[model samples]
Target: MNPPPPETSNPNKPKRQTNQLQYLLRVVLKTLWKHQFAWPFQQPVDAVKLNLPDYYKIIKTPMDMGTIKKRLENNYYWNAQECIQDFNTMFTNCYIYNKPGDDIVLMAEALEKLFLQKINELPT
Candidate 1:
């Protein structure tokens, strides 16, 4: 979320309404999610904003969550892994928790094997 501005001494200027504040917080987060790929996080808002168009052209896709899930059901497992890493990368903005991610990967492998075997034997 955009950091709230420093407190204002000018009481004549009423503080922003709570709803307005919350709205902008959500906006900032969405903006950050779509962009924000630098190894080191930025300190200024416009610097982050400036990166948006380039990143969108280079990396962003319009796929929403439902579309992603559907693609996975059709067996896009690599895409599934990419999506998880994408969210994980965006979620923490760091790649420090690999062992847990590895655990999930191992689970995906096992489930795929089990499900595919049972599915192939569905006549049973």
Candidate 2:
């Protein structure tokens, strides 16, 4: 008899090919913050069913500090954190969820190693 294939995490989204969460963390999150923070926004692939209210609703990534700052200052109706949170929630709802826990390094690890290294302020 043959062994069974492992169980996968398919809550409500397409079965992703790889750990995009890892890719997002490794590729994007690592590079996003510097003296400031940034985010990227793109529409999902055609087959995705996001929790967004309207189909045409768009996510706007951070363009630059000045541009974002200006928008924050001038844009009256923007609920800055709300959509950021929603955007994050969509990932939880739709990710493949099929990988082991090793991929994502805890922020504590990042803080102890990367962030504190930059800060140069770790306790002696």
Candidate 3:
């Protein structure tokens, strides 16, 4: 008798295809990490050092590239969408905390645009 195909909510993607998507995600992540404007997003903001007491108040859940790296290494994300959500959260936090025309806000906008463009380039 033949073995049954594996049951999955997303059965169209086989194991190898999933792995390929993960690898592509990592590739995109690395490119973003190396961007010149990526410095502000490399790690969680030092609220004390920066003297922004209201930062925590304004940004409830802070997300950073380091945290994303850790989550990616730990296999915390089940799919590309989950990982992409982290990137969105990270940029959104920056926008919310910084003034509209601030340098960091500009960087965040550029990075967000770049991220979307890169991900859209990926194979479906």
Candidate 4:
């Protein structure tokens, strides 16, 4: 036997609440980026507002997170071993210790993998 059809709300179901959550998340992220990158992580509220267009341009470059990491290690002269150690420390202290929900745990794992791929691509 077939299951009953699913129920539906009134034809005008309050327009589905517009995806405001994504916009709020973007705003929060932009604010954090402005503070961290523009102000060198010194000031938060007083940090220079990043130009959205420029931010998009930078973020949309062909490079993925891994490529960016490799570039940082090689071109920027960062110490790869120290960087990896610090990343591990941050992940353990901030993410693993906090015991995030499934979605957050997945996101952290994906991000870490991407970053590791990028780091591995660095020129020795």
Error of 4 at 70 (Å): 17
> For residue 32, what is the lDDT in candidate 3?
88
Q: TM-score for every candidate vs. truth?
A: 0.21, 0.23, 0.79, 0.34
Q: RMSD for each model, in Å, please? A: 18.0, 17.1, 11.0, 22.0
Q: Which model is ahead, 3 or 4, in terms of TM-score?
A: 3
Cα RMSD of predicted structure 4:
22.0
- Number of backbone collisions per candidate: 0, 0, 0, 1
How accurate locally is residue 14 in candidate 4, as Cα lDDT from 0 to 100? 30
- Expressed as tens digits, the lDDT of each residue in 4-117 for candidate 2 is 211222235332222333333333335433423122212232323434342223322212222222222333112434222433443342222213343322322332244334
- Please provide, for model 4 over 43-116, each residue's C-alpha lDDT reduced to its tens digit, 9 standing for 90 to 100: 21111253323323232212222322332323322244533453454334335333567654555465556445
Candidates 2 and 4 compared by lDDT, better number: 4
Worst 10 residues of 2 by lDDT: 1-10
Q: Which one is best on lDDT? A: 3
Pairs with backbone N, CA or C atoms under 3 Å apart (clashes), candidate 2 = none
Q: Report lDDT (Cα) of residue 46, candidate 1.
A: 25
Model 4: residue 16 alpha-carbon error in angstroms:
54
Model 1 pairs whose backbones collide:
none
lDDT of 3 by residue, 1-124 (tens): 1122212234343323356346544777788899999998887777776788788878877888877776666566667776788889999999899889999999999999988888886655
Report how far residue 109 has shifted in candidate 3, in Å.
0.8
Worst 10 residues of 4 by lDDT: 38-47
